[PDB]
């Protein structure tokens, strides 16, 4: 069907199984002193994390104070200059002998592809943390400073009123 069937073990665990789970896990721990499914109550025991700390799904694999970059910068600049130079040479190829133009085209793309690699090491979450950091920091400083400004102006008004009433005495 369109919707896959519920998992099979879901139907094994009734309320009685839930209430008898404590004694079952106590007995299992006492006896113990891929997990084989010898009893229907085994699944409620929390599954163990794989030792390799890896998870595979759909053909793809998955697994501290914030809780020479100049070399990369100059590499990027020289790569951009070489990319412009190669673009000029490739368009010249198109001009004179376009029949073999593709011979350079993908080459240029490789440099562009390398640029993407040069982005990968530069990857930005810390920079986003920084920018959010300063925006809420400056917002709270603005709120604070307007607080002492308003309380100070109220105090100044109170002192002026006190002087006015003392003069009228």
């Amino acid at each position: 069907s369109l919707y896959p069937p519920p998992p099979p073990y879901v139907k094994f665990f009734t309320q009685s199984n839930l209430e008898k789970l404590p004694k079952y896990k106590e007995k299992k721990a006492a006896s113990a002193k891929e997990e084989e499914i010898t009893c229907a109550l085994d699944y409620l025991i929390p599954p163990p994390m794989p030792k390799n700390q890896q998870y595979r799904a759909f053909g793809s694999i998955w697994q501290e104070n914030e809780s020479n970059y100049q070399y990369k910068i100059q590499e990027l600049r020289k790569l951009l200059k070489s990319l412009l130079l190669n673009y000029l040479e490739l368009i010249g190829v198109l001009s004179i002998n376009p029949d073999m133009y593709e011979r350079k085209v993908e080459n240029i793309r490789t440099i562009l592809v390398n640029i993407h690699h040069l982005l990968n090491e530069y990857r930005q979450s810390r920079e986003s943390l920084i920018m959010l950091l300063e925006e809420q920091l400056e917002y709270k400083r603005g709120e604070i400073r307007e607080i002492e400004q308003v309380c100070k102006q109220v105090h100044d008004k109170l002192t002026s009123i006190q002087d006015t009433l003392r003069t009228g005495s």
């Binding site: 790569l79 070489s82 190669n86 040479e89 004179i96 002998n97 029949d99 080459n107």
Partner: protein
Amino acid sequence: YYVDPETTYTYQQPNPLQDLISVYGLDDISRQVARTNLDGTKAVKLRKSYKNQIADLSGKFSTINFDWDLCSSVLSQFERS
């Protein structure tokens, strides 16, 4: 990065910039069936098909294992009848 002094590209031959008709001395037929003469006047009247190449021959072209002796004898007998 891709600047390779060892990689040299030669001029495409023949060069389209030059007069490709006169490269191999191929001007005679082109002049023979040229659109216009050197003065620009029309040389000959132009048309489509091969019909006018047979007009000199006699005729009115308004709309455009084996025994030969035995067949000839059969035709002779048929005509004589």
